[PDB]
Amino acid sequence: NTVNIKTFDKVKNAFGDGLSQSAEGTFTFPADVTTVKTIKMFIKNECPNKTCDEWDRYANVYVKNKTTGEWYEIGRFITPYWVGTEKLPRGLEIDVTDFKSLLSGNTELKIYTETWLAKGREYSVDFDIVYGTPDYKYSAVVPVIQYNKSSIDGVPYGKAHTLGLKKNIQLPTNTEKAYLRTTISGWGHAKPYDAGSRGCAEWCFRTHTIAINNANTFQHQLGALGCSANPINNQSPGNWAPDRAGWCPGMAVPTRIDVLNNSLTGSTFSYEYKFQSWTNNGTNGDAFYAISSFVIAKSNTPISAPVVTN
């Protein structure tokens, strides 16, 4: 079984006086998610005849955690230059199965675009829920860190001292499978440039590390994705083809999945996101990393949300 749920219908994120960069709404999702195998989120950006903010703007979607009243980023993308997602049949696709526990019953969603023009961007969002026999009937998800309000509200990169990326995580004793879900994209053309005149953090290729209990465990390489091969190839005269570090205009920001070893099940461990070292000399602007990292706990027996603590 595959149920399609329609959620935002030509909603506009715009900037200027009786307008907003974000839109919200409440939608009804089926209540039972125990047999949900996959949930695909589709984002359609309609921008016919240059009627939208022609820049490659940062955008993201959130689902509200009813109990805590906190917004969780389920997906982000960079809008294409000058056009919408027309070359793509169903729009940008992002797997959001990790958030099935929050995508049930009356769910409030939020979509934001860092647009600075009144014409902004218009979107239609729908979800495909595929029912079946999942490998794990239950899942729980909680954020470890969230500095993703916009491209320039991320974590400053290259500053003398930085903090706010070390946390402690306690996984439920019945966790059968656990993993981290991270989405990271950078902004800026700050100096000193890397070879090839690549400023940070939009252009400079880096490899960040996540340390579990002080041991370097996962590496996140923000390298070339092959922007020139983008299906949305009608973006000229915008600078669409050059490879940025870990993202391309008119494409979803990749979701990075790192599987935790089961020796962490039932125990509290430390998590630290370590940026590859670099110092901003401050002569050519700022550099930021917009980042969200989530811990997902799965089991075939009802499970409570992992505890994240400083």
UniProtKB/Swiss-Prot annotation:
Active site: 56, 114, 202
Top-level taxon: Bacteria
GO molecular function, one term: oxidoreductase activity, acting on paired donors, with incorporation or reduction of molecular oxygen, reduced ascorbate as one donor, and incorporation of one atom of oxygen
Disulphide bond pairs: 47-52, 200-204, 227-248
Technological use: Widely used for the removal of N-glycans from glycoproteinss and glycopeptides in laboratory.
Keywords, ordered alphabetically: Disulfide bond, Hydrolase, Signal
EC assignment: 3.5.1.52
The reaction(s) this protein catalyses: Hydrolysis of an N(4)-(acetyl-beta-D-glucosaminyl)asparagine residue in which the glucosamine residue may be further glycosylated, to yield a (substituted) N-acetyl-beta-D-glucosaminylamine and a peptide containing an aspartate residue
Top-level enzyme category: hydrolase
Listed Pfam families: N-glycanase_C
Result of altering residue 56 to N: Complete loss of activity
Purpose: Cleaves an entire glycan from a glycoprotein. Requires that the glycosylated asparagine moiety (reaction 1) be substituted on its amino (R1) and carboxyl (R2) terminus with a polypeptide chain.
Subunit structure: Monomer.
Note: PNGase F binds primarily to the polypeptide chain around the glycosamine junction including the inner di-N-acetylchitobiose core on the carbohydrate moiety.
Protein name from the UniProt record: Peptide-N(4)-(N-acetyl-beta-D-glucosaminyl)asparagine amidase F
Organism: Elizabethkingia miricola
Origin organism lineage: Bacteria, Pseudomonadati, Bacteroidota, Flavobacteriia, Flavobacteriales
